[PDB]
Amino acid sequence: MADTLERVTKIIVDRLGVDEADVKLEASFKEDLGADSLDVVELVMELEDEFDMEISDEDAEKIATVGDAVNYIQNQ
């Protein structure tokens, strides 16, 4: 769904201050979008709450890229 990706993208733009055009699926939060580790924890917390789901420690660590985040949401 497009609504899911709009919601994910809105949050990344809110937190990381990047252009929407830079929020591609392959973009990694740290290497491409300027997030550091505190930011990334914060993003995941925020995504969890937006989609009313709990992500485990083990699964959250696999989330390097925008696409990784959407994949997890889409599998719940």
- Is residue 36 part of the annotated active site? The answer reads yes
Residue 9 sits in the site that holds Pt ion (CB under 5 A): no
From 3, 36, 39, 57, the catalytic residue: 36
Q: Residue from 9, 18, 32, 42 that binds its own copies (CB under 8 A)?
A: 9
**DSSP string for residues in the chain:** -HHHHHHHHHHHHHHH---GGG--TT-BTTTTT---HHHHHHHHHHHHHHTT----HHHHTT--BHHHHHHHHHT-
- Using Cβ positions, the residue closest to Pt ion within the complex turns out to be 1
Residues at the site binding Pt ion, with contacts judged by CB under 5 A: 1, 4, 25, 67
